[PDB]
Each structure stands twice: as structure tokens, then as C-alpha cells.
Design a protein around this ligand. Structure first.
Ligand SMILES: [Mg+2]
Ligand SMILES: [Mg+2]
Ligand SMILES: [Mg+2]
Ligand SMILES: [Mg+2]
Ligand SMILES: [Mg+2]
Ligand SMILES: [Mg+2]
Ligand SMILES: [Mg+2]
Ligand SMILES: [Mg+2]
Ligand SMILES: [Mg+2]
Ligand SMILES: [Mg+2]
Ligand SMILES: [Mg+2]
Ligand SMILES: [Mg+2]
Ligand SMILES: [Mg+2]
Ligand SMILES: [Mg+2]
Ligand SMILES: [Mg+2]
Ligand SMILES: [Mg+2]
Ligand SMILES: [Mg+2]
Ligand SMILES: [Mg+2]
Ligand SMILES: [Mg+2]
Ligand SMILES: [Mg+2]
Ligand SMILES: [Mg+2]
Ligand SMILES: [Mg+2]
Ligand SMILES: [Mg+2]
Ligand SMILES: [Mg+2]
Ligand SMILES: [Mg+2]
Ligand SMILES: [Mg+2]
Ligand SMILES: [Mg+2]
Ligand SMILES: [Mg+2]
Ligand SMILES: [Mg+2]
Ligand SMILES: [Mg+2]
Ligand SMILES: [Mg+2]
Ligand SMILES: [Mg+2]
Ligand SMILES: [Mg+2]
Ligand SMILES: [Mg+2]
Ligand SMILES: [Mg+2]
Ligand SMILES: [Mg+2]
Ligand SMILES: [Mg+2]
Ligand SMILES: [Mg+2]
Ligand SMILES: [Mg+2]
Ligand SMILES: [Mg+2]
Ligand SMILES: [Mg+2]
Ligand SMILES: [Mg+2]
Ligand SMILES: [Mg+2]
Ligand SMILES: [Mg+2]
Ligand SMILES: [Mg+2]
Ligand SMILES: [Mg+2]
Ligand SMILES: [Mg+2]
Ligand SMILES: [Mg+2]
Ligand SMILES: [Mg+2]
Ligand SMILES: [Zn+2]
Lengths: 159, 218, 103, 58
RNA sequence: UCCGAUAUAGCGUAACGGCUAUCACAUCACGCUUUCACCGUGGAGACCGGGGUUCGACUCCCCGUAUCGGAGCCA
RNA sequence: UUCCUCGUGGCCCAAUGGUCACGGCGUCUGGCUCGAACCAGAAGAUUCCAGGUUCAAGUCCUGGCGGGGAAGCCA
RNA sequence: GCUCAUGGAGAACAGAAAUCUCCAGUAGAACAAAAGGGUAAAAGCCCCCUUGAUUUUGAUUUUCAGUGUGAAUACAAACCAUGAAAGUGUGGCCUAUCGAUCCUUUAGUCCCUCGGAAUUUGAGGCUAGAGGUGCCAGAAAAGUUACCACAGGGAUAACUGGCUUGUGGCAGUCAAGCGUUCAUAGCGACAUUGCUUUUUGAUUCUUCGAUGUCGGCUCUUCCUAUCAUACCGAAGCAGAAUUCGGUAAGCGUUGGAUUGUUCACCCACUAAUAGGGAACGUGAGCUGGGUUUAGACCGUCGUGAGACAGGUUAGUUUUACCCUAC
RNA sequence: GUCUAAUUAAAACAUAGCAUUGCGAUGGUCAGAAAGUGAUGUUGACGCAAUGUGAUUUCUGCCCAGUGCUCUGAAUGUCAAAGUGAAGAAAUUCAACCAAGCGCGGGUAAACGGCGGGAGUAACUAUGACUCUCUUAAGGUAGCCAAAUGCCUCGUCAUCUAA
RNA sequence: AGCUGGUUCCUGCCGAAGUUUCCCUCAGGAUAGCAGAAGCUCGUAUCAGUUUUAUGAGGUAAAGCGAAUGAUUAGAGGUUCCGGGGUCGAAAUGACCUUGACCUAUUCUCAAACUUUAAAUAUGUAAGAAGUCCUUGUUACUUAAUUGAACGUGGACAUUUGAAUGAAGAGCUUUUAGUGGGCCAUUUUUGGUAAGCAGAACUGGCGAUGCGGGAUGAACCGAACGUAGAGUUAAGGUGCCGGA
RNA sequence: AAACCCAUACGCGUAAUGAAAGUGAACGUAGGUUGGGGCCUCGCAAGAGGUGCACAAUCGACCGAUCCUGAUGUCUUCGGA
RNA sequence: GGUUGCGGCCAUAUCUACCAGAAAGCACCGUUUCCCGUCCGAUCAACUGUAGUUAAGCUGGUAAGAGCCUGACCGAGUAGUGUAGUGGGUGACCAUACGCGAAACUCAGGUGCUGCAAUCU
């Protein structure tokens, strides 16, 4: 017979870790989640209450509700030819802030600082990021760095 | 009643070993893996000759037994019962299956065809890679031409391509000849029953002096 | 299984609306009434020729029945109903389980 | 007479013909599933705020 | 589901609300016969399970289990 | 090959998951009279093999072996 | 509150295992069951108190059509338990353990209706459950047909043919040994490489608006993996006879008893009585003994009608004048 | 003697003989929508009706547990409608009573049909008159057989043939 | 009749499915998907079968077993008040030796249902005006508390407004057809000796598609088609058949 | 049988919701926020501001049903703000 | 800088064996009337801070220590892998092109950092 249950194919995913079994540190419960916060989902196997379905492991969503012990997360799920929005009520042990948003907001305030700094003299900040450009010309010296000539080596067994 | 080896030559399936899900297999027709003066020390037999595979294939346990017997019987009679130490370096752990059909006239009436065709164990095989060592025999340099012939005779018992390589190491060691020699001239080396222990510059010093005192008595 | 004959649980009787002692019994269906509309209809439909006019079930597969408890509040005599999981054996008179005692 | 049981062949082509559009995001999304203890206060707070702005620019 | 019956020593069986209960068989002995069987005398052994009525339950009332017979059967 | 069933003292056969196991025949000892029959008494078991389930496995669950049985049809 | 499996060291009866003490012990144990996850001042073991396995309905996740059921999640408004308290608790540590309409039945509100108007019974309604559909989105359901029928199917069997070649058959490599001695005159184990498609299977591509199935008779051709004949080589070839091998398919390879037989087995002759293919060559070429319609008998099975690669007997073999080939 | 006219002429059917079963006429078997209606019956147990087997000869063994058929009826058995009694304001409900049938108890196989399994044992060996044990309603008797009935099977021996 | 067969003019534009769930459902239907038509609101975006930067998730390949579980070859050194044997022996918590198990450090080989570790490819999110910051207003929620939460007023920051590339117009709705037998190739992979076998995963194709090439061929290579002309080429080729 | 003319009804619709008894749609410029074509004002233009139909999202309000709360009062059990 | 209370990250913090420990603090330690709990004032509870001791716990250090952590042009750009070819090869498989890129091993180094409050020669 076939078998498609809630925790089917979760053997290694809801495994806990190597040398990180037991209880969870208190920072998970002392973290603070407001509505609109972006959170990644990673299920802890030692907290069986408030778990996500295996589909939402490694999924990033937005908080829409906050309760005593849980947090309401919105996720986008591909169902055929479209996306549907999914509302999970997840305990916070299965929840951590995404660092991408923090790294974006640091750049936001840095760009604001640059703009305010360089508006005092009008020097065309050009705040946009840019890709890694091609490398410019340069000169390579042989002072103490004379070229060392190499050659292909023959075939040996090495056993 | 034994199905030929061309039917199980190539690695077509995953490893299927004896376990608590298989639970019913025959025993290997090879049981001995060390022949000759297996109790000899490392200084007695410096030279090592390998019979290595050049093809990705399976080897039958009975083929291994036949090759072992042929090699040992040649090398004993020529050089002596204690002029070599021969080691079979691959072990048959992969179980082969047979779906047994009726060979009688009137069989389609009962056979049910490919329905319920998952087979039953009937043999074992060893899965070998390219560059993988099948046999390894160590001797003195005086007996090279005898073990080379003993392995050249064993080759006929296997399918595929097998090469005979003279190893640059000291016997069954992972060290080259001059390296082992310049480690045995000092006291880094300590013989055991058949293999050897090496001194490390790591660990407690009391133990490394309790052993290997010839290295410190400089 | 074994259930006690008494149980303190919620009563909705418009005077308690709170937890109260309830007497527990086992529910039994009740005798099927003639003059119920279905039986009247079925007897009318079975009158005459044509034979059996409705289906009659045979393909029984479940060995058990769900067990239902009637919970009578001792104060207002409001009785409630609550159903249990499936059980081949069921008991009200409880001789409790004891750990240390020997076989 | 057996037949073919299952395949996902051609399903991505089919989906991407008119497909993988994100649903969409609006301002002021639904408060559905949100805590009623929060909704009940938000009602009164919005009432008071409207009253205050009315009386302010009255 | 309805009616009726039954459950009793190791087996089976009988009984009045004034008995932890008679019986033939099974076994413990004592007896009697040349012996074997046959046979006689004392014993030790049991009221289907749970509640209720009662100066007193095998026995009456209720519930449940198992068995038998006959009747019935709209999820 | 599939399915069903059984495996028990020297032989035949039985068993509530609840004493290192009921009976009968055979054997042995003694008696009666030389032998049978008969009267008394004893001994004899790793419950087919390998695993597990339970406080407890002969029994409860899986595989193998052996004995038996049923099926093996349309062409 | 305590820490388990296990090991080690000790204590009368007491030993391998009774009870007691100590040390080590990251879980090697237990947590109802299947397996996998998870859990150590606990989710385990012992003890205390309890019924939150409660009420009201709503939302969410999984299966998914984003329907239902089932299961689960987090909240809300009550009422409770527990604990010093924080807090936990809406059944089982998590992942399975279950069920529409209609009908019946119970509980609740004691509410609505019985329509000329009332009272009391009865009945029907509202809301929540139970009685079950395991073919588990849920018909009320025994066989046979060899007297058979119809619509269809090459989506699907019984032939050939095709792919494959396990099985069958044939042939190689190697050489432990046999052969008085001697591996290879002749053989050749343990192993291994292949060919063939005259075996049987596997498969189901073609054919079900039909490609006439077994065998034999008759006739032709082809292959060679050569039985004989021609020429040779080798021998454990003195001769004779025999064995192995090569070039060779040019020429030949029989008559009979029994069997429907293919196959087989015997008699005899023979230089020899080799193997095969050609839609398992060949039915508008025959025959029709057998298989395989309908009649009938037996045995076994079946209540029966009837079934049986079980046996027996009886059972219509059509057309060429066309094209091509000859 | 008879039959599948147009694929089966037979061992199939029939037959005489044998046996069983029902019925004494307000009856048995059968017919008919019904009937002051019919066939058997212009009949009467040496008859009619219904079955089976199939001349003669010689025989027709055991089983009534099962399914059937039949026979018995005092019954703490069950058992419909009608009828009876109580309760009720009535619908109605509840009780007792309740024919046949079933069940209870007997018979019947020339009714349907059925009619064992394992061990040991005779001082050459083999076999097993004999014993033990389990078990059935009874355990396949007299006879017969590789038969039109035997898979194994081209069974084994002999005869028939050169085979 | 869920089954066979047939179903009558032209051109133009668009253009499928053989898959999901349910059904006494498996030669059929409903449902969703794929397609068409009608369009509606707008006007370069509330986009993208793509990359980059940042950030997560994973337990396959590989690898490992002198790291846990399990399998596994070989010896070496050790311990028995305590496995089985012999010898000195009365025995001894007594000795000499043999064989087993157990311990220590080593050694050879392995795992779809083992693993410390662990890719490549695929995958989630984000990269700003619905944004950031400052000030102070509402509440019956929350707080020890004008403390917070949410929603706000007012004010400041504009085209380098917050990476690249492209957008062929973006978004939205209604209705309805056919389809629900599939098949092949590369690669991953299951059963099977294997199969032009059976079954899955990703893409691309045939079906529905002609053209040049592969002599010949549904799928391979190349390339996709209005009618014509000229030129250049793909794949494949240049002895003759045959252009070179 | 055409064409022309016409009354009263009837049908759909203008009110829904509840099994039913039955009750029955404005706090407000017929609400607020966000966006919105078009129009208006200033501006050479760029753009800024005002108004903002339709449509979309969202928070509210009103009617019915359900579950509560249960005033003045009264056939003291009716009524139901 | 040491110590205590409460912690954060959770072995660079653990483990084995030794050594040392001013001051203060923690600790062992002393007693059983009361609250309280045990077979046992051993644990738990209460009282004293008095009679004593750094012996242990605790802190730190030592070890060519085991383990753990970090790094490396160590292995190895290896294995493996995305994409491509009318590439090779009877095949099994293998090379090449444009890309990504390990683990073991080897070597080297390290062996708790830190927050709030209080207290200390
Ligand atoms: Mg993980
Ligand atoms: Mg076939
Ligand atoms: Mg009637
Ligand atoms: Mg299909
Ligand atoms: Mg005796
Ligand atoms: Mg606890
Ligand atoms: Mg659901
Ligand atoms: Mg709660
Ligand atoms: Mg739970
Ligand atoms: Mg139900
Ligand atoms: Mg009802
Ligand atoms: Mg279904
Ligand atoms: Mg029929
Ligand atoms: Mg037929
Ligand atoms: Mg038939
Ligand atoms: Mg076909
Ligand atoms: Mg072959
Ligand atoms: Mg072969
Ligand atoms: Mg075919
Ligand atoms: Mg056909
Ligand atoms: Mg035709
Ligand atoms: Mg023809
Ligand atoms: Mg030849
Ligand atoms: Mg053929
Ligand atoms: Mg012909
Ligand atoms: Mg016939
Ligand atoms: Mg019969
Ligand atoms: Mg047949
Ligand atoms: Mg005829
Ligand atoms: Mg005729
Ligand atoms: Mg006859
Ligand atoms: Mg008459
Ligand atoms: Mg009556
Ligand atoms: Mg009667
Ligand atoms: Mg159905
Ligand atoms: Mg069709
Ligand atoms: Mg996996
Ligand atoms: Mg691997
Ligand atoms: Mg590794
Ligand atoms: Mg390991
Ligand atoms: Mg990413
Ligand atoms: Mg459609
Ligand atoms: Mg459809
Ligand atoms: Mg088609
Ligand atoms: Mg094409
Ligand atoms: Mg290509
Ligand atoms: Mg041209
Ligand atoms: Mg030319
Ligand atoms: Mg609005
Ligand atoms: Zn109450």
C-alpha cells in the first residue's frame, strides 16, 4: 500500500542535529516578532506542537499575526499554474528572523547617510550597487618574481 | 544450474547486501582471504605485486575462489608454501538475484510471467572499480617472476581486464621503500604479528618512550 | 475500556453554566416507533405487490460500535451526551488498576 | 489491458503557457485569522482616530 | 431484535427464601472374594459474573456473557 | 510453484499462554503361578530446527526442513 | 522527586539470575503497538491531586478540485484541574488507528408548525451526537452454458513472424588432475568468453468486418554445426579396427512391428541409416487418425445445472475460368 | 425396434422383466381465468397414476449421522390475523391466549447419497495371518480391474511378432 | 447502446490533450489543466521558465568505518578467585601448556532501507514611494508606567529611487470547444538474464510537421514552411551513379 | 389568419432573511483609508494641489437568522428597550 | 584581576591524571526545639555562623595528553557534478571543451569569551 502522511519523508529533515539534541536555548523565546517581519521556517523535531508541514521547511514568509506562544506566517505556495497564499500558525521554535532584511535595512540607512552627506556639496552620490566589473589595467613586475617555467609531468602509478 | 556470469557482470543494480531486510542468502564460496606466510613480518617481504582491475564490473565469489586456488597452487609448487603472502583485497558483499522460471514444456500455464518477478538470492559478487586492487601478493625481489606468473594465471578466471602492477611501496605498507628504510634505520618502526606500528610526534611522551626507545636512544 | 460512574464536567442548564457532578450511564438507542413518518411511509410503500421497495444492508464490516455516555447532572437533571472511540469491551464499574500488586 | 498510471510529462509546459504569475499583493490585506482580541481594539481605535481628525480639521 | 430455556463438585444432574446444596459416575481409604472383575460403608470435593428486594437469595427483580430452539429484519 | 494443515517419551494421540506436559500401548521391578493374562508400583521429554512477543511460552508471531492434502483451467 | 540499559567490585543461607551497597555509565534503556523521528534535574520510573478525553461555535495546515471526510495546528469567549508560581492542559510525545444523503434514535431549546379557533396526547421541524456503508465520496444481489447469442476488441490471450536468449543446443580460453611415466594422443574439474534461434520461456509490436493449428503422405530447394563417400593431417596408429581434426554440402542418407503422434523404442538391411530451415515449407495438393462445436459412456468434483491438457466412441474438409509464377 | 429431416444410427432411447411410491372415489395424478367445467374414467387395486433399473443366470453387502420424504401430538417451546383482558380522554400501547408450519421424538437407502488413517510384528530376505492406537453414521462386503473407469504408465509377468 | 462505421463548399487567423481528484471507476464521464472567442480597466507597470549580491533550507552523488549501528579478513599483546581440554598433581583464591570466547592497539573490505562530514544541479525570500526617518494623536488590547502594538495627522528625503538584462503592451473577467489510449531520444533511475519489455524523474521532440541530410525509416542531425528572385550557408558530402 | 387599437389582470423586477412563527435595510455630505480615468486651478513646460464616477482591496455601519444581555412597564407572565 | 547570585553563546567550555590556591566569598562543616520529610535529620526542612577545614567541591595551571575549535597554494582543483559534441571505445566505460567543487588524510595554531548587580588586598 501507499503512504502519504503528515510527517512522511521527514526522517532526516526533522532530525535534530549532531551534538545539538535536548532543549533549546532561550534566545528563541526571547526574540521578538512583529507583524510584517520576514521569517524563515526550520522545524525543530523536539517540539512536536506547532510544527510546519515538511513543505514549508526552508521557506521564508511574512508575519501576519502574533499570539501567546505562536506566530502567524504567510507563505506563497505553487499549486499547478498559480500561487496560493498559505497561513501557518507556527510556534516560535520553528521560526527565526531572516538576516537578508537586516542586511537590506543597513544598506537603506547607509544610503540615506551618504545622500545627506553628499547633498551638502552636490557630488552625484550614485548610490546604486553595481555588479563586479571587469578588472582594469595593471603592471606586473618580475623583481624577485622571475617566471618559473613548468612542464607536464609523465605518467606514474603511485600505488 | 548456475547462471553464467555475463548475466551479472556489470553494475546494473544498487548494492544489495545481506541485512535484516534480506535475511536469507547463500554463503560465499570464498572464505579464505590470506594465504602463504601470513604470519611473516614486514621486513621479510619488501616487494608487493598487485592485480588491479581496469573495468567497472562485478566479480563472482567462485571466480575469486578459483583465482586464489590457481595462484596459490602455482606459487607454492614453484617457490614454496612460505615464499609469499597473498591477500584477496575485495570481499563479496553484493547479493545477486534470480527470478526462476519453469523450464518445462507447458510452463506458460503456471509461470505467471513477469508478475511478482522480484528475485531470490542465489550468489554473491564483489563490485570493483577502475584502479581497484583485487589481489595483492608480497614477496622478496627474488620471487617476482613467480608471483607475476601466478597472477597472470589467475587473470583467466576473472572477466574483464586486469593489470599486474609492481608497487613502489614496502609490501602491504603505504610507505615507499626508501621512506620505510630510513624510518627503520631509526626506531620509528615496531613490528607486530604481521603488520607494523609507526611512531608519531603526537601523543603522550611516556607511552612513545615506553615503546620505540631505539628512536630516542640517539 | 473502563470509565467511572461519576464525572465532574460542564453543564449547560441555564442555572449552572459551570462544572458540576454528572452521573454517567451507557446510551442505548431506543425502540423504533410506529407512527414515525419514515415507518408510515415505508409500510405504505411495502403494502401490496412489488416486494422489497427499499434497500436492506448486509455488507457488515465493523465489529465495534462507538460508545456514548449519558451524563446526568445531579442538580438540574440536565443530561448531556458524549461519545468515545471504538472499543470491543467497555465497563462502568471500575475496579482500578494497581501498580505494585503482584500477578 | 494495463495502461499508463502517472506522469508529470508536459505539465510544466502547460503551466507556463499562462502560468506561474504571483497571485498579487494589495495594500490593506485581510485581517482574517488575526487575533480577535486585537481586532476588537483596532475597531475602537480607528473610530476614535476618525473622530479626532474630523474634530481637528472641522 | 422478541419469546422461551439452560449454565451447579473433575463430568452430568435435582432442588420449597427456615443449609457454603442431595444425587450416579471420577478419586481417598476401609471392607468382601483364590485372584480378577461385580458389590457395600464413611470421606474431601460445586450454585455463570455483577448490582437490587428481603428476620433469611442457587432460588426473586435488573443488567451482562455463553449456548440451544423458534420467530422476525428499510440506515 | 501457490494455498491449507501437522510435527510432542520407543509407538498412536491430546492440551485454557498459567507447574521442566494428560492418556493408552511398549519397557523395567516386585508379586500370583513356569510363561502369558492379572495385582501393585517405577523410569523415560531439551514438545522438528533458527529467531522474537509477555512476569510466564508446548501453545502467541516469521523463515527453513520434512509428511500429507487441494489447485494447476479456456485455448 | 529520582535516573535508565549494561558492566565491574563486594555482602549468610544465596548459586548464572532473589535482596542490599558502591563506582562507572550521552542513553547503548523505557515512552501500548509497526517503523522512523524526538526526549535525561524529561516526554522515561515512583508518588500527590485530578477529569481540559468539558462548552460555544469560527479560522488555519495536510490529502486537495485548494470539495468532503479523517487527523492535526493556533486563537477567541466561558468553566475547570494542577501547581508556591510562572505557566501547562480542548485526549494519548509526533507521524496511522476511520465514514455522506435518506431513515431511525437520543440529548438540547421547552423554542416553531399541525394552516376555521382553542386545550391535551401524537406527529412533524431547528441545533449536536449515535445506529454504516472496509468495493472505506458510501447499489439491496448466487451459479452454469460443450445448445448459446449480440455490440465490439488485435486496448487482450490461443499460431507463425519480430526483439531477447534466461532455459535448451553448439563452440572456445585457462589448465588442478586422469591417462603405467606424461597437463593438452584423447579427455579435462574450479572458473570464464561467446555463437545460434530446429527447444521452452519472457513479451504483446502486427492480425479477432477470420493469414484454415497436430501429424503423415507428396515434391522442390537451401544451410552445415559432415553420418557415409573423395583427399589428407594426428594418435596411447605395428597390421586390422577405431578415435581426433581439416578442406569439403559434389553425391547419397532405407525397409518395417507398436503409437494419431512429433518424439520414442525395437527388428533388419546398409557405404551410411547426419542434423536442420524454407509462414514450427507444403489442406482451392491429399488425408482427417488426433486436438477442439453439437450425440453418448465412464471415473473424480459438484446439492444442482454442469466442470475436468482425464479416459472412450461417433462426428459435411467448399470455389480458380482471373493476375503473376511455373 | 427408435431418434438428432440438412455433418453424430451409437454403447444413446425404448423394450419385456424387476423393484419402489401414492390412491378405496367427499379419493390419487393432472388440467382450467372461472364454472351447475374437465382428462384418467365406457375406469376401481390382476386398476390408475408417478418414478427408477433394464432379457436370462447368479447376486443385490454396511450406513438413517447429513439432506430429503414420512409418522406420531398431553406439552414453562415458538407461532399470524381475528377475538379476549387491563391502562388510557382517545388514537394507541401492553399482556395473556394463539391453527398449521418449524423444533422436540421415531421410521425409511431397489430415497438423494456415502462406505478410513498411522505404527510394530513370523531367526535368510520379503510380505504381514497377528497386535497396538486414533477415528467414523458406516468405514468399500461379495465380486471385478491398468477395463469405455489407473495419474504415475509404453505399470510388471506371460502369449501373440523378426521386431 | 459508455460500442463499430459514416458525417457534404473555399480561404484566412489562433491553436491543444493524452495529465490532476472523484465515480461498480479502468473502451465512459464529471472536475482542474491545456485552446479559442468576446472582450473590460488601464498605458510601460503590483512583471519575467534568466543572471547577480545578500540570505536561508536540503542529506542525494562523492566520502567514512584505526567516528556511532550493522556486516567483515588477518595476525600481535593481555586478563580469568570465573568457558572447554590435557600434564605436575590429593586439592588449593595451585602451577605448566592447548583451544575458545572478552579487552587493548592495529589491519583488509562494504552498506537502497548506517553515518560524523558533504557537493554540483535544482529551490525559498529580498534588493524601497504600499519605502526610510522625525514629531505626537486613538484604543475597550498591553504595560509597573504615554510603556508598547496597530492604525493615523503633520514634516523631511525624488529620478542612480537604491543590482543586471529584457518587456514583444500590463492586469482582469465571462463563456465555451476538443482532450483525459500516448509514444520516442539524451541523461537519472526501479523490476527483470534481457527485450523494439514493464514502470517512474527532468528536458526536448513525434503525435499535430512538411523541408535538406542519415541509401531506405514517426522520433536522430540540421532547420521549422505565405508566393517568387538573387546571394550565403547548416547538417551531410565532393571516383562514377550524384551537384561538388 | 395580415396590419391597426385597448381595459383589467397576470408574469418577471423594484427586499431580503429565516425550517418556521416572523422581523425587515442611512450615526455619518449613504462612512473612512489606499489607489484610480476624466475634469478644475497654478505652471511656458516639467510637474504640484483640489475634486475624484466605474472598478479593486480593506476597516466599519444597517436588515435578517443564531448565541447572549434583559429597561420603562405588566392579565406576573407577557413584552423586548 | 579573584569570588558570589542571575545569565547569554553552549566542549576553545568536555574527559583522564597530577600540582597550587593571599584576601574575601562559595563550600564542607556543627545541632535537632520548632515548620517539614525520610527505613535512616544520608537527601529535604529548620537553627546556629558558634566548635574546625581548604581535605574535597569550586578556580587556575601543567600534559610532544584523548576530544573539540579554527586555518591552510596538505591532500586536491582530486573525487563527484551542470552543460556540449555525427568525440573514442564491441561494450563496460573513458577522455576533451565551457563551468562548480568536496570529505577523509597531512601540517600548524588554540583549549572558554562575555553581560547586569554585589563584594574583595
Ligand atoms: Mg538536518
Ligand atoms: Mg504464448
Ligand atoms: Mg399484502
Ligand atoms: Mg490513462
Ligand atoms: Mg511386569
Ligand atoms: Mg518532572
Ligand atoms: Mg480538511
Ligand atoms: Mg486554555
Ligand atoms: Mg498531542
Ligand atoms: Mg454516522
Ligand atoms: Mg428526524
Ligand atoms: Mg471509493
Ligand atoms: Mg443467467
Ligand atoms: Mg460458450
Ligand atoms: Mg466451460
Ligand atoms: Mg497489440
Ligand atoms: Mg542462449
Ligand atoms: Mg546456455
Ligand atoms: Mg501475439
Ligand atoms: Mg484474429
Ligand atoms: Mg480481410
Ligand atoms: Mg492463404
Ligand atoms: Mg565446414
Ligand atoms: Mg522458429
Ligand atoms: Mg496451400
Ligand atoms: Mg462431442
Ligand atoms: Mg455426488
Ligand atoms: Mg478442455
Ligand atoms: Mg444429421
Ligand atoms: Mg448419418
Ligand atoms: Mg439404456
Ligand atoms: Mg378425479
Ligand atoms: Mg395476534
Ligand atoms: Mg401448533
Ligand atoms: Mg460507488
Ligand atoms: Mg475504440
Ligand atoms: Mg532520502
Ligand atoms: Mg555511495
Ligand atoms: Mg566522510
Ligand atoms: Mg563501522
Ligand atoms: Mg538562492
Ligand atoms: Mg474541459
Ligand atoms: Mg473533460
Ligand atoms: Mg491521435
Ligand atoms: Mg520536426
Ligand atoms: Mg545536439
Ligand atoms: Mg538557390
Ligand atoms: Mg560530378
Ligand atoms: Mg468602502
Ligand atoms: Zn445543571
Amino acid at each position: 500500500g501507499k503512504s502519504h502522511g503528515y510527517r512522511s519523508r521527514t526522517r532526516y529533515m526533522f532530525q535534530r542535529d549532531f551534538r545539538k539534541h535536548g532543549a533549546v536555548h532561550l534566545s528563541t523565546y526571547l526574540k521578538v516578532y512583529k507583524v510584517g517581519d520576514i521569517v524563515d521556517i526550520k522545524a525543530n523535531g523536539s517540539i512536536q506542537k506547532g510544527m510546519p508541514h515538511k513543505f514549508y521547511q526552508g521557506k521564508t514568509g511574512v508575519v501576519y499575526n502574533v499570539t501567546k506562544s505562536s506566530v502567524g506566517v504567510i507563505i506563497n505556495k505553487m499549486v499547478g499554474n498559480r500561487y496560493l497564499e498559505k497561513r501557518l500558525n507556527l510556534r516560535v521554535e520553528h521560526i527565526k528572523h531572516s538576516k537578508c532584511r537586516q542586511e537590506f535595512l543597513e544598506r537603506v540607512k547607509a544610503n540615506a547617510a551618504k545622500r545627506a552627506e553628499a547633498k551638502a556639496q552636490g557630488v552625484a552620490v550614485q548610490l546604486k550597487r553595481q555588479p563586479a566589473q571587469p578588472r582594469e589595467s595593471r603592471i606586473v613586475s618580475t623583481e624577485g618574481n622571475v617566471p618559473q617555467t613548468l612542464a607536464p609531468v609523465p605518467y606514474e602509478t603511485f600505488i | 544450474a548456475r547462471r553464467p556470469a555475463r548475466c551479472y557482470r556489470y553494475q546494473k543494480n544498487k548494492p544489495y547486501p545481506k541485512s535484516r531486510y534480506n535475511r536469507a542468502v547463500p554463503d560465499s564460496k570464498i572464505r579464505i582471504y590470506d594465504l602463504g606466510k601470513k604470519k611473516a613480518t614486514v621486513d621479510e617481504f619488501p616487494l608487493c605485486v598487485h592485480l588491479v582491475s581496469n573495468e567497472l564490473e562485478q566479480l563472482s565469489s567462485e571466480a575469486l575462489e578459483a583465482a586464489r586456488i590457481c595462484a596459490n597452487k602455482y606459487m607454492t609448487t614453484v617457490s614454496g608454501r612460505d615464499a609469499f603472502h597473498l591477500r584477496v583485497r575485495v570481499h563479496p558483499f553484493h547479493v545477486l538475484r534470480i527470478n526462476k522460471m519453469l523450464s518445462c514444456a507447458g510452463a506458460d500455464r503456471l509461470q505467471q510471467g513477469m508478475r511478482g518477478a522480484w528475485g531470490k538470492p542465489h550468489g554473491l559478487a564483489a563490485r570493483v572499480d577502475i584502479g581497484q586492487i583485487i589481489f595483492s601478493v608480497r614477496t622478496k625481489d627474488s620471487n617476482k617472476d613467480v608471483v607475476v606468473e601466478g597472477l597472470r594465471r589467475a587473470r583467466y578466471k576473472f572477466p574483464g581486464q586486469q593489470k599486474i602492477i609492481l608497487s613502489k611501496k614496502w609490501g602491504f605498507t603505504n610507505l615507499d621503500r626508501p621512506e620505510y628504510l630510513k624510518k627503520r634505520e631509526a626506531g620509528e618502526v615496531k613490528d607486530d604479528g604481521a603488520f607494523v606500528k609507526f611512531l608519531s610526534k603526537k601523543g603522550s611522551l611516556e607511552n612513545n618512550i615506553r615503546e620505540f626507545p631505539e628512536y630516542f636512544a640517539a | 475500556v473502563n470509565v467511572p460512574k461519576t464525572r465532574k464536567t460542564y453543564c449547560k442548564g441555564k442555572t449552572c453554566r459551570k462544572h458540576t457532578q454528572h452521573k454517567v450511564t451507557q446510551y442505548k438507542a431506543g425502540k423504533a416507533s410506529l407512527f414515525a413518518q419514515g415507518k408510515r411511509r415505508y409500510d405504505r410503500k411495502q403494502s401490496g405487490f412489488g416486494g422489497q421497495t427499499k434497500p436492506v444492508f448486509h455488507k457488515k464490516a465493523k465489529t465495534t460500535k462507538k460508545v456514548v455516555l449519558r451524563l446526568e447532572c445531579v442538580k438540574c437533571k440536565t443530561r448531556a451526551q458524549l461519545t468515545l472511540k471504538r472499543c470491543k469491551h467497555f465497563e462502568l464499574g471500575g475496579e482500578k488498576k494497581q501498580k505494585g500488586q503482584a500477578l | 489491458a494495463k495502461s499508463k498510471n502517472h506522469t508529470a510529462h508536459n505539465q510544466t509546459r502547460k503551466a507556463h503557457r499562462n502560468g506561474i504569475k504571483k497571485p498579487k499583493t494589495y495594500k490593506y490585506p485581510s485581517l482574517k485569522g488575526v487575533d480577535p482580541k486585537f481586532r476588537r481594539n483596532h475597531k475602537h481605535a480607528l473610530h476614535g482616530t476618525a473622530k479626532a481628525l474630523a474634530a481637528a480639521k472641522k
